[PDB]
Design a binder for this molecule. Structure first.
Ligand SMILES: *[C@@H]1O[C@H](CO[C@@H]2O[C@@H](C)[C@@H](O)[C@@H](O)[C@@H]2O)[C@@H](O[C@@H]2O[C@H](CO)[C@@H](O[C@@H]3O[C@H](CO)[C@@H](O)[C@H](O)[C@@H]3O)[C@H](O)[C@H]2NC(C)=O)[C@H](O)[C@H]1NC(C)=O
Ligand SMILES: *[C@@H]1O[C@H](CO[C@@H]2O[C@@H](C)[C@@H](O)[C@@H](O)[C@@H]2O)[C@@H](O[C@@H]2O[C@H](CO)[C@@H](O[C@@H]3O[C@H](CO)[C@@H](O)[C@H](O)[C@@H]3O)[C@H](O)[C@H]2NC(C)=O)[C@H](O)[C@H]1NC(C)=O
Ligand SMILES: *[C@@H]1O[C@H](CO)[C@@H](O[C@@H]2O[C@H](CO)[C@@H](O)[C@H](O)[C@H]2NC(C)=O)[C@H](O)[C@H]1NC(C)=O
Ligand SMILES: *[C@@H]1O[C@H](CO)[C@@H](O)[C@H](O)[C@H]1NC(C)=O
Ligand SMILES: *[C@@H]1O[C@H](CO)[C@@H](O)[C@H](O)[C@H]1NC(C)=O
Ligand SMILES: *[C@@H]1O[C@H](CO)[C@@H](O)[C@H](O)[C@H]1NC(C)=O
Ligand SMILES: [Zn+2]
Lengths: 194, 592
């Protein structure tokens, strides 16, 4: 039962607030083959080790991936706050996890490049008493996702439906595309083994 | 009832104001960092759109009655929206007031004095300012001081007379006693119980704190007079007031530029890390990274990525014209920027800390509704900015950053030099600010008839500030109008209370940081408790009365000047020892 990572290697990686999630079960994961296709720049694990991640059996293997510039790596750290964690992605630390920031080599052509990197700067309900900010749950999506699906063509651009407001930020992609992967393991117990 | 309709109205206003305010701010930023005619046109269009929206919304808001509203947040928003201002005047009167204001601003900006010797016309900036800041020639300084007041103030006298009448009419149209009462309305708190604060209480508190400030200022005044008698023998009475044109600038607002004539220990050099910064190859980005690290160390948030990629931290060299005044911009919707032409110097280091403190204050209250996004009153923002610069200059903070040697020795002569230099800027400007605002309050109130405007101006100068005019001036002069804030219609008491707030905040945080020793050596770095205590007040914005925010940060709800006297106590002891063979005080009878 070889594991298929093909859909991740095909298409355009999404923005962070619309991250892609792949769940694997009853698999045989060749993790080294997957990671050898990218120029890895950062690999930080919690409750596990990079060598221990590539060994042992798990009941389920989840990968959340998106396009993300490595120069923003400081905003994607455990205990860090700010707009990225609040409105785009919150890493769930209830299980062993590993965050990998990598660069796409010019070899890979199935991975097409987006026009811009994008993220949300705020997501709130409006009222007469101020802004009621809506925060991401650990490992969950933003409640402003439907509004953000419209798209952003300028910096600090707002979309509102009347009871919800979201603001987006974009900046162009230069050079090789950079990506972020979040790997989580949940653990019958030998479905996913090396 | 009325409250529900007001709530609906305010929800609509809050929803609609965000985009218009953001576009106006963005146009203003694009003009300020890139000076072109098209940018001016875009900025004007954005400002016009925002003004039209705000006028329509104020007109709609005036229909709701404040007495019916129970919730205080809604009441504060509605009271902010219901203020008419100059719109309470008739169209002809409002047009006349605008014409007078523009004329006074133009007269101040384009005034010139002709030097007889060189046949050269000097403007205030940079021409006359260079004389008052650097000259030690009695006659040259007198020529500049008298020429500026004879050439510019005599033009402003009749315009200012008309301006006073028009502004009093405007103030009485908005249900105020006069224009000074209207200005003091900034500090007024109503319907809050023990936190209430009236407009007369402000004058009472200012007088009470100034009476406590007076002895330290008298010791400083005597020290400065004794020092200046060496530079100007036969021009200075040992028991009299100081001549007004020998104080280091055009008005005597600050005594800073007198430092080289009054330094207690000339042989001891001050602490300057600029050479160390050049030796280690610093740049502006590293300076701002250090400021960010300082704020992170007290458990404040990081800067945003947009802050790093959208600010103007250095002067551009691509052919763009900019303004190099350091400013912190809160455009809205999560957009925070800083405009600064940073050099590699200690002063730019301190300024970076100060402006990032402004940014932190802007970020703390971002969730408040639009009309409540500001400091608790007009003095809070600058005091918050000042405490960061206080912490950043200490030898402890500089030694931690490697800008000083680990075996650096701190002698008390260097400390007394530092304290004297601080006092020349901070203590010396308080009587000036107090006297100016008191005179303006009495002119607006009518306690000074126009036949005595100048007469009361110099009588107060001699008795509150200890400063005497070198030449007598009749009622054809208007000396107060020769100052920028008076000619541009700006209230001045913010510079007083801010000072009082500053040393109240600092002393409160240093005790939270468990500092041991003198207050002027305190550095609050690596103290998360002090950062949390500061954030408690910062998150409030303007949604609470300022007395409640003050009690949140310092534990009492009143202005107190004892922390300021605690900051300067070693200098006070040294001064009282130095003036032991001198006269302390002044007479109001001697004249140059
Ligand atoms: C604020 O605090 C930081 C961190 O302080 C560190 O953690 C605290 C909880 C305490 O246990 C501190 O003792 C501890 O240092 C200070 O930065 C730290 O400064 C010290 C100075 O003693 C540095 O130690 C040096 O480290 C280098 C290696 O880089 C050695 O060559 C030296 O021999 C010496 O051990 C330490 O590295 C440094 N830590 C970091 C992360 O930079 C900081 O100075 C302080 N700020 C102020 C204004 O006091
Ligand atoms: C800087 O500090 C020195 C040293 O003072 C010592 O260290 C300080 C940090 C404090 O802890 C002091 O308590 C401590 O003594 C000062 O010099 C000292 O000044 C005092 C006056 O305050 C001198 O006392 C005098 O001594 C003579 C006898 O020689 C008597 O005639 C006097 O009546 C009086 O008691 C003391 O001698 C002197 N010390 C030395 C070593 O000269 C210094 O004034 C101070 N400078 C500033 C600008 O603050
Ligand atoms: C500074 O302003 C000038 C003119 O105000 C800008 O030049 C314009 O750039 C836009 C790009 O969107 C061109 O389409 C216009 O034709 C240009 N106008 C002119 C008159 O040349 C310039 O880009 C601005 N500089 C920066 C750094 O934003
Ligand atoms: C995993 O993939 C790598 C490719 O780099 C390969 O060398 C290795 O044998 C694979 N692991 C297996 C087949 O267990
Ligand atoms: C693919 O990347 C590898 C890894 O370095 C490199 O050797 C190879 O040249 C690349 N492919 C091409 C066509 O250059
Ligand atoms: C106003 O209403 C808000 C929300 O309904 C509430 O939090 C606040 O305490 C109220 N204030 C007053 C003074 O009634
Ligand atoms: Zn400032």
């Amino acid at each position: 039962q070889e594991c298929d990572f093909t859909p991740m290697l095909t298409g355009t990686p999404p923005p962070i607030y619309n991250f892609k999630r792949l769940v694997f079960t009853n698999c045989n994961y060749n993790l080294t083959k997957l990671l050898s296709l990218f120029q890895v720049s950062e690999f930080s694990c919690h409750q596990v080790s990079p060598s221990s991640l590539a060994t042992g059996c798990y009941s389920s293997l989840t990968v959340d991936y998106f396009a993300y510039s490595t120069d923003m790596s400081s905003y994607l750290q455990p205990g860090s706050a700010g707009e990225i964690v609040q409105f785009n992605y919150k890493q769930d630390f209830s299980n062993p996890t590993c965050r990998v920031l990598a660069t796409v080599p010019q070899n890979l052509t199935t991975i097409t490049k987006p026009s811009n990197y994008a993220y949300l700067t705020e997501c709130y309900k409006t009222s007469a008493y101020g802004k009621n900010y809506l925060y991401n749950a650990p490992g969950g999506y933003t409640p402003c996702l439907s509004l953000a699906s419209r798209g952003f063509s300028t910096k600090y651009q707002s979309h509102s439906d009347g009871e919800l407001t979201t603001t987006g930020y974009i900046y162009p992609v230069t050079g090789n595309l950079q990506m972020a992967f979040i790997i989580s393991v949940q653990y019958d117990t030998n479905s996913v083994c090396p | 009832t009325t409250e529900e309709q007001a709530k609906t109205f305010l929800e609509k206003f809050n929803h609609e104001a965000e985009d218009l305010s953001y576009q106006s701010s963005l146009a203003s930023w694009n003009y300020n960092t890139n000076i072109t005619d098209e940018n001016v046109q875009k900025m004007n269009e954005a400002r016009a759109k925002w003004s039209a929206f705000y006028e329509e919304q104020s007109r709609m808001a005036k229909t709701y009655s404040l007495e019916e509203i129970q919730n205080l947040t809604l009441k504060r928003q509605l009271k902010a929206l219901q203020h008419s201002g100059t719109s309470a005047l008739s169209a002809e009167k409002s047009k006349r007031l605008n014409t007078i204001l523009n004329k006074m601003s133009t007269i101040y900006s384009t005034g010139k004095v002709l030097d007889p010797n060189t046949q050269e016309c000097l403007a205030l900036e940079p021409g006359l300012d260079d004389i008052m800041e650097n000259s030690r020639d009695y006659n040259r300084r007198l020529w500049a001081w008298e020429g500026w007041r004879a050439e510019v103030g005599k033009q402003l006298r009749p315009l200012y007379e008309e301006y006073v009448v028009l502004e009093n009419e405007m103030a009485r149209a908005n249900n105020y006693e006069d224009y000074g009462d209207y200005w003091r309305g900034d500090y007024e708190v109503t319907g809050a119980g023990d936190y209430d604060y009236s407009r007369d209480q402000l004058m009472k508190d200012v007088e009470r704190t100034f009476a406590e400030i007076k002895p330290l200022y008298e010791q400083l005044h005597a020290y400065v007079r004794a020092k200046l008698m060496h530079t100007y023998p036969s021009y200075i009475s040992p028991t009299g007031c100081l001549p007004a044109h020998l104080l280091g600038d055009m008005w005597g607002r600050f005594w800073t530029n007198l430092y080289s004539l009054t330094v207690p220990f000339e042989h001891k050099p001050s602490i300057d890390v600029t050479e160390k910064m050049e030796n280690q190859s610093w740049d502006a980005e590293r300076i701002f990274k250090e400021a960010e690290k300082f704020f992170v160390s007290i458990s404040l948030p990081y800067m945003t990525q947009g802050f790093w990629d959208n600010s103007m931290l250095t002067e551009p060299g691509d052919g763009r014209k900019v303004v190099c005044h350091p400013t912190a911009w809160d455009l809205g919707k999560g957009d925070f920027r800083i405009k600064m032409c940073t050099k590699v110097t200690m002063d730019d280091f301190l300024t970076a800390h100060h402006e990032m403190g402004h940014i932190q204050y802007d970020m703390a209250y971002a969730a408040q509704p639009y009309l409540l996004r500001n400091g608790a009153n007009e003095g809070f923002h600058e005091a918050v900015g000042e405490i960061m610069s206080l912490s950043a200059a200490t030898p402890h903070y500089l030694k931690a950053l490697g800008l000083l040697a680990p075996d650096f020795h701190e002698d008390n002569e260097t400390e007394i030099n530092f304290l004297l230099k601080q006092a020349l800027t901070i203590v010396g400007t308080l009587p000036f600010t107090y006297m100016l605002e008191k005179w303006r309050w009495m002119v607006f109130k009518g306690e000074i008839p126009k036949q005595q405007w100048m007469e009361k101006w110099w009588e107060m100068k001699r008795e509150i500030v200890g400063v005497v005019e070198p030449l007598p001036h009749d009622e054809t002069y208007c000396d107060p109008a020769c100052l920028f804030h008076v000619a541009e219609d700006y209230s001045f008491i913010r510079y007083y209370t801010r000072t009082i707030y500053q040393f109240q905040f600092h002393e409160a945080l240093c005790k939270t940081a468990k500092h041991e020793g003198a207050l002027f050596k305190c550095d609050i770095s690596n103290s998360t408790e002090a950062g949390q205590r500061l954030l408690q007040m910062l998150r409030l914005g303007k949604s609470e009365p300022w007395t409640l925010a003050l009690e949140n940060i310092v534990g009492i709800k009143t202005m107190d000047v004892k922390p300021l006297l605690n900051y300067f106590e070693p200098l006070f002891t040294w001064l009282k020892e130095q003036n032991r063979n001198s006269f302390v005080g002044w007479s109001t009878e001697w004249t140059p």
